[PDB]
Coordinates of N, CA and C in Angstrom, one line a residue:
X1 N 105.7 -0.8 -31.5 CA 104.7 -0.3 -30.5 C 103.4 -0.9 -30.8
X2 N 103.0 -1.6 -32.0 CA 102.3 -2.6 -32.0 C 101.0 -1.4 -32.6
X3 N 100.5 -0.9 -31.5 CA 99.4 0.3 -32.3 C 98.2 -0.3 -32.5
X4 N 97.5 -0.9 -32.3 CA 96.6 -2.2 -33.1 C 95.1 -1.6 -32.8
X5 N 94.2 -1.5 -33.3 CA 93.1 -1.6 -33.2 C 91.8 -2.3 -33.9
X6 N 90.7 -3.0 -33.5 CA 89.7 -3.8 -34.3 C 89.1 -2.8 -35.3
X7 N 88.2 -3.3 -36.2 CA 87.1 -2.8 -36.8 C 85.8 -3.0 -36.0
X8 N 86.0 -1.8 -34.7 CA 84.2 -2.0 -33.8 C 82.9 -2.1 -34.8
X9 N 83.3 -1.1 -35.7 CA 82.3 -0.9 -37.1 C 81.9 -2.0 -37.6
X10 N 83.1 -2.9 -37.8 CA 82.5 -3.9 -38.7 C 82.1 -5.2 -37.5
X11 N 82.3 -4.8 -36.5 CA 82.5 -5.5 -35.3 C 80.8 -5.4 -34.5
X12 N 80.2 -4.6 -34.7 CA 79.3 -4.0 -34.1 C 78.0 -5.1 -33.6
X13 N 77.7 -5.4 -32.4 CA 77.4 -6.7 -32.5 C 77.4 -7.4 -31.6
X14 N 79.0 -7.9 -31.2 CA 79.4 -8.6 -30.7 C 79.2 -9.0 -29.3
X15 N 78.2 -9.8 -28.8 CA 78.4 -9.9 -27.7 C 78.9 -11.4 -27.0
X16 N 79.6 -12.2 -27.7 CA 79.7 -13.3 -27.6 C 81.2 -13.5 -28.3
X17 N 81.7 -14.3 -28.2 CA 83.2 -15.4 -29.3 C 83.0 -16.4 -28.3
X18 N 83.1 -17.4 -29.4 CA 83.8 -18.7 -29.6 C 84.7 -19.1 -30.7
X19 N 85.8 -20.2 -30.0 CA 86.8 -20.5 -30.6 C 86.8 -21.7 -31.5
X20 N 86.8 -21.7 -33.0 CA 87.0 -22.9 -33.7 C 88.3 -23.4 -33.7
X21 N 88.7 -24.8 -33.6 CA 89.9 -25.5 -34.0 C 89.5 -27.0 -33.9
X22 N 90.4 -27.8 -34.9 CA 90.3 -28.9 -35.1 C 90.7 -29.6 -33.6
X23 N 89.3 -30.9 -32.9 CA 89.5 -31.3 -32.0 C 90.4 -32.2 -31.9
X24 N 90.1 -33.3 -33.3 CA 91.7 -34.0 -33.2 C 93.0 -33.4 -33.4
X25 N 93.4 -32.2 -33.3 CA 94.6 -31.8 -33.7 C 94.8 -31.2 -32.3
X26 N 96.0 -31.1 -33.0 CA 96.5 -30.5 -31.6 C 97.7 -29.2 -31.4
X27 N 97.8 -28.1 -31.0 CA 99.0 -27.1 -31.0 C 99.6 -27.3 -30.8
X28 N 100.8 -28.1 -30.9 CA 101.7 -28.1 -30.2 C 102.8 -27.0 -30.6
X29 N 102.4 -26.8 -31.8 CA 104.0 -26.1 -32.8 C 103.1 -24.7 -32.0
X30 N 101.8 -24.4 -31.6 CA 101.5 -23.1 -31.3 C 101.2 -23.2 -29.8
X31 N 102.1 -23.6 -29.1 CA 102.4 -23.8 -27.5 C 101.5 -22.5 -27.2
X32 N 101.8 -21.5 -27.5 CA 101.2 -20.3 -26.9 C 99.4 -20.3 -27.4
X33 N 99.3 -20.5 -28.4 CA 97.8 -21.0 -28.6 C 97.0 -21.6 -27.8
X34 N 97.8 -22.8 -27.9 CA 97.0 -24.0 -27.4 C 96.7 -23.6 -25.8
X35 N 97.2 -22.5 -25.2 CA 97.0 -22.5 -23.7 C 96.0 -21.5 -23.8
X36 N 95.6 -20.6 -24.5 CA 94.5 -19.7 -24.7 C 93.6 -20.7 -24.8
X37 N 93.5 -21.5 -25.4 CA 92.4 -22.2 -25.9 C 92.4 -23.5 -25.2
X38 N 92.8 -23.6 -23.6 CA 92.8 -24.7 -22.8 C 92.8 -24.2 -21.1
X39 N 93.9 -23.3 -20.7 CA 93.2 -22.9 -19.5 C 92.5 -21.4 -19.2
X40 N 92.3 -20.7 -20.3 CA 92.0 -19.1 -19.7 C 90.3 -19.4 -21.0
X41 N 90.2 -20.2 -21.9 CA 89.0 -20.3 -22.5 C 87.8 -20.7 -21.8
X42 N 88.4 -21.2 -20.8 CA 87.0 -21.9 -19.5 C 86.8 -20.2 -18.9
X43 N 87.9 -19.7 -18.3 CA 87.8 -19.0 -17.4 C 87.3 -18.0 -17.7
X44 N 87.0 -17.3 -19.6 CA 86.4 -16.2 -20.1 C 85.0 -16.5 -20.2
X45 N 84.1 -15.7 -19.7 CA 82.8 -16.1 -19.9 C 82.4 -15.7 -21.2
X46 N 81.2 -16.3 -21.6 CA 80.5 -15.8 -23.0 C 81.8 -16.4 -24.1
X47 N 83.4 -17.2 -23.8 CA 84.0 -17.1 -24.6 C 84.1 -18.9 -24.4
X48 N 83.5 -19.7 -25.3 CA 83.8 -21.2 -25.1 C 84.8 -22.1 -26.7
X49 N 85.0 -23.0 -26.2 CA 86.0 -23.6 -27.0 C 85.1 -24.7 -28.3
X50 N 85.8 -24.8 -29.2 CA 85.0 -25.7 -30.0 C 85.8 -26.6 -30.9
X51 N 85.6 -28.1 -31.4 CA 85.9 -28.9 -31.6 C 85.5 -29.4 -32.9
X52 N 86.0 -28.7 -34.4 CA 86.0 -28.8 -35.3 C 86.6 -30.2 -36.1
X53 N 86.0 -30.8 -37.2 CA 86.7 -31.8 -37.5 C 88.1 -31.5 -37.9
X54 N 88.5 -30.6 -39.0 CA 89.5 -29.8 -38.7 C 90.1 -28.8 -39.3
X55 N 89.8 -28.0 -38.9 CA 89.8 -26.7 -38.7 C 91.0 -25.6 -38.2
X56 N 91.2 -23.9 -38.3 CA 91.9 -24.0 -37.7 C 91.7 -23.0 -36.8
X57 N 92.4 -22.7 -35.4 CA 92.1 -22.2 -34.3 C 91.9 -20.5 -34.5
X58 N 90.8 -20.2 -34.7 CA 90.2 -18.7 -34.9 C 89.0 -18.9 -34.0
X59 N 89.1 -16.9 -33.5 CA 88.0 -16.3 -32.5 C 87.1 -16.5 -33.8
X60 N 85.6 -16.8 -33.1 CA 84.4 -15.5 -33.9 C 83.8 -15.2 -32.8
X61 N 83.8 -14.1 -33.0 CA 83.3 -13.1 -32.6 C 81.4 -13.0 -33.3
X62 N 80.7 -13.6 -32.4 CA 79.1 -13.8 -32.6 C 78.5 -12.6 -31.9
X63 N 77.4 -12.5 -32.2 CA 75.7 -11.6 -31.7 C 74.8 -11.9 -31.0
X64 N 75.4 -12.5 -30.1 CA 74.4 -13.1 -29.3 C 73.8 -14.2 -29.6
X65 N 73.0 -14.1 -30.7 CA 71.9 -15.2 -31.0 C 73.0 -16.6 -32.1
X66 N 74.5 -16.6 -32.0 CA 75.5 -16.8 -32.4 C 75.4 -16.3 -33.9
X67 N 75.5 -15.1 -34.2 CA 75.2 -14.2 -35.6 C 76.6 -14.1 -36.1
X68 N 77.7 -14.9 -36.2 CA 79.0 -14.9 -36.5 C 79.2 -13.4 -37.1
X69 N 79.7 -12.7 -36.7 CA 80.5 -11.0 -36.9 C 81.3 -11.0 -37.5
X70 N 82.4 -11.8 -36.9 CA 84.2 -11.8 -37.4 C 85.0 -13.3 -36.9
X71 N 85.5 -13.3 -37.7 CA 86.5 -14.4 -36.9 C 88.2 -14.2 -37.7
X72 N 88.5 -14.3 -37.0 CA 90.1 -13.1 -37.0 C 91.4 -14.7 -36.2
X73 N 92.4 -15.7 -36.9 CA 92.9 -15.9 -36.3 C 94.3 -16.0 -35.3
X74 N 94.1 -16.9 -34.7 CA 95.0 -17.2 -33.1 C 96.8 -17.5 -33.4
X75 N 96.6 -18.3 -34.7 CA 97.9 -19.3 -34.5 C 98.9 -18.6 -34.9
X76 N 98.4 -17.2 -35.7 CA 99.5 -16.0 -35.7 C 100.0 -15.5 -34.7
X77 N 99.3 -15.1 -33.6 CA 99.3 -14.4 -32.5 C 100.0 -15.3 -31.6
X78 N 100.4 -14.4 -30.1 CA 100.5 -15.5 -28.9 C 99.6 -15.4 -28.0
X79 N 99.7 -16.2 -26.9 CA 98.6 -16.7 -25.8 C 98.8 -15.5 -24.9
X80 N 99.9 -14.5 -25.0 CA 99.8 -13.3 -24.6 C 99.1 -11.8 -25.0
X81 N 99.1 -12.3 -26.6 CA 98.5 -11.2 -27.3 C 97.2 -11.5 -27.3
X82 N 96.9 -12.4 -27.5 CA 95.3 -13.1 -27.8 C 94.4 -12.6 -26.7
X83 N 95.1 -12.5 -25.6 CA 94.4 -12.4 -24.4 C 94.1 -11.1 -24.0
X84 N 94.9 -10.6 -25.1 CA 95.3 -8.5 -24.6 C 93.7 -7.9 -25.4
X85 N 93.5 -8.9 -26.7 CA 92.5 -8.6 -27.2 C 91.2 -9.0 -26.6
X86 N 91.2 -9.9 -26.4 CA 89.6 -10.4 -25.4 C 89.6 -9.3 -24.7
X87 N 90.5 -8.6 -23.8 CA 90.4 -7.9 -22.8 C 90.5 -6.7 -23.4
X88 N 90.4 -6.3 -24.9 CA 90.2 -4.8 -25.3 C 88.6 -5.3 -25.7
X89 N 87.5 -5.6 -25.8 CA 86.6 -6.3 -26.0 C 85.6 -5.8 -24.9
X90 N 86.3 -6.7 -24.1 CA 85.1 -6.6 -23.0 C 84.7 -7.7 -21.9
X91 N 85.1 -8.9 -23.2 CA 85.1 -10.2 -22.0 C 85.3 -10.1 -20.5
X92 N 84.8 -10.8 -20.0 CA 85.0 -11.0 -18.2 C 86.4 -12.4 -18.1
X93 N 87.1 -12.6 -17.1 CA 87.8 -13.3 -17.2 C 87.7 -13.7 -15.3
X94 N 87.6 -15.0 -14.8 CA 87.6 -15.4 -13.2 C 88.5 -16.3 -13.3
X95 N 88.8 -17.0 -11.8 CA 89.8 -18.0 -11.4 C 89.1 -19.2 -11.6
X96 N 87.7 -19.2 -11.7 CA 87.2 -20.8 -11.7 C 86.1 -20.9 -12.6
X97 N 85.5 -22.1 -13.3 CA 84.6 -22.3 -14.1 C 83.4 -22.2 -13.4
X98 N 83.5 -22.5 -12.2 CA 82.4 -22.7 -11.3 C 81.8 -21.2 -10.3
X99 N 82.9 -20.0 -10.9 CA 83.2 -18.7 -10.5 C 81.9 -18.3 -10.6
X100 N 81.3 -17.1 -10.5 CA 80.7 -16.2 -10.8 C 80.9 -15.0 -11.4
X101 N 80.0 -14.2 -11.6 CA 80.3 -13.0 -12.0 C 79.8 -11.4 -11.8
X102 N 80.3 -10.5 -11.5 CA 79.8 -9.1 -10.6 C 78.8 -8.9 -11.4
X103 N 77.6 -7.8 -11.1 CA 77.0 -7.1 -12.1 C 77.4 -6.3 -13.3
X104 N 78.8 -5.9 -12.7 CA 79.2 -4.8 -13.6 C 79.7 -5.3 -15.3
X105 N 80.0 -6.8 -14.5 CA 80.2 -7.6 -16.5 C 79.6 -9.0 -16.4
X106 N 78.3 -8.4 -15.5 CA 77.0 -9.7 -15.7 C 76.4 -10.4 -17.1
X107 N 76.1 -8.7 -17.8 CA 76.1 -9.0 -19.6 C 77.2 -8.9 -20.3
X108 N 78.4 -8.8 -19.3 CA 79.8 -8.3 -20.8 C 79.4 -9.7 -21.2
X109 N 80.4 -9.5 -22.3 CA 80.6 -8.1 -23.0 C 79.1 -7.5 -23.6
X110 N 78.4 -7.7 -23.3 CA 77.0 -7.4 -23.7 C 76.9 -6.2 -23.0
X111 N 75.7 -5.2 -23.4 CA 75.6 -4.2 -22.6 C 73.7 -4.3 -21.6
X112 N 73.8 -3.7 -20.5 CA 72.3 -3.9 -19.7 C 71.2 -3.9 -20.4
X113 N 70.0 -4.2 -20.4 CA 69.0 -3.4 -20.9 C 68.6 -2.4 -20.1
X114 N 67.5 -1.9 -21.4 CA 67.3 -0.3 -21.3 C 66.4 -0.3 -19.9
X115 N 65.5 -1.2 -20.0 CA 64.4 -1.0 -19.3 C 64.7 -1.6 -17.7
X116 N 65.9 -0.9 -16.8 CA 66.6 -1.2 -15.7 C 67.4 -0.5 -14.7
X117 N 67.7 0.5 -15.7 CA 68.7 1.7 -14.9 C 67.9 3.4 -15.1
X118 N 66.4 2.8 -16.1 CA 65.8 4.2 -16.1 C 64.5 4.5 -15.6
X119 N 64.1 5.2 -14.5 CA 63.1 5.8 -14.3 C 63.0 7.1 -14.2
X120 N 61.4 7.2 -14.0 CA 60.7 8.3 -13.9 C 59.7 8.6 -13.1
X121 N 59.2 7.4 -12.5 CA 58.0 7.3 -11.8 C 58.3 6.8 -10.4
X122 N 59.3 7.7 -10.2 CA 59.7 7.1 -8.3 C 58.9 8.2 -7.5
X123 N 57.6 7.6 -6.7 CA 57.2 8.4 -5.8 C 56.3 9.4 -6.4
X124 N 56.3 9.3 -8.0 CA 55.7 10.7 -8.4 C 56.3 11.7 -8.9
X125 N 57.3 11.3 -7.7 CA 58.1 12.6 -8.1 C 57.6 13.8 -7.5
X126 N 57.4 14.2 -6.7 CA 56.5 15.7 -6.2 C 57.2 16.0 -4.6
X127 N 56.5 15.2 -3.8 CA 57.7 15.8 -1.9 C 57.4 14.4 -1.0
X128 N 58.4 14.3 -0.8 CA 58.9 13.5 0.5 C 59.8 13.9 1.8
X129 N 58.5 13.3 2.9 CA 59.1 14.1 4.1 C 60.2 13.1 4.4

């Protein structure tokens, strides 16, 4: 039943992953890999691919300012599972590179700022006819 959950704790942070792996190499023996990290890597925002001399294919999980958090990896997992996780996260995921994206995961996985969704000074506040 699999059961799985991150360390948000040690996770705490995160508003960003990018993927290391060696650019001259190649998955093949990790077929299910190598497609996480070729067609659905474009399509995750905030989530881009990288081209290590060589390296092997692991998330990190950065802070925005790329503050590396975690990096946890891929070639264990499948291109099914890998994706289950992005999507317990937060990441945004579209059909095209060229896509956009709603407000509602404009900063995912990042959260709004403060100074946007709060007032106090509408009108006064006192009567409106």
């Amino acid at each position: 039943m699999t059961n799985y959950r991150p360390d948000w704790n040690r996770l705490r942070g995160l508003a960003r992953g990018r993927v290391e792996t060696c650019g001259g190499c190649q998955l093949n023996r990790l077929k299910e890999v190598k497609a996480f990290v070729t067609e659905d890597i474009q399509l995750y925002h905030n989530l881009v691919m990288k081209h290590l001399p060589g390296a092997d294919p692991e998330l990190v999980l950065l802070s925005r300012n790329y503050q590396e958090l975690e990096r946890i990896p891929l070639s264990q997992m499948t291109r099914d599972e890998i994706n289950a996780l992005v999507q317990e996260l937060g990441f945004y995921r579209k059909s095209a590179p060229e896509a956009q994206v709603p407000p509602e995961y404009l900063w995912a996985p990042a959260k709004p700022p403060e100074e946007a969704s709060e007032h106090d000074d509408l009108e006064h506040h006192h009567h409106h006819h």
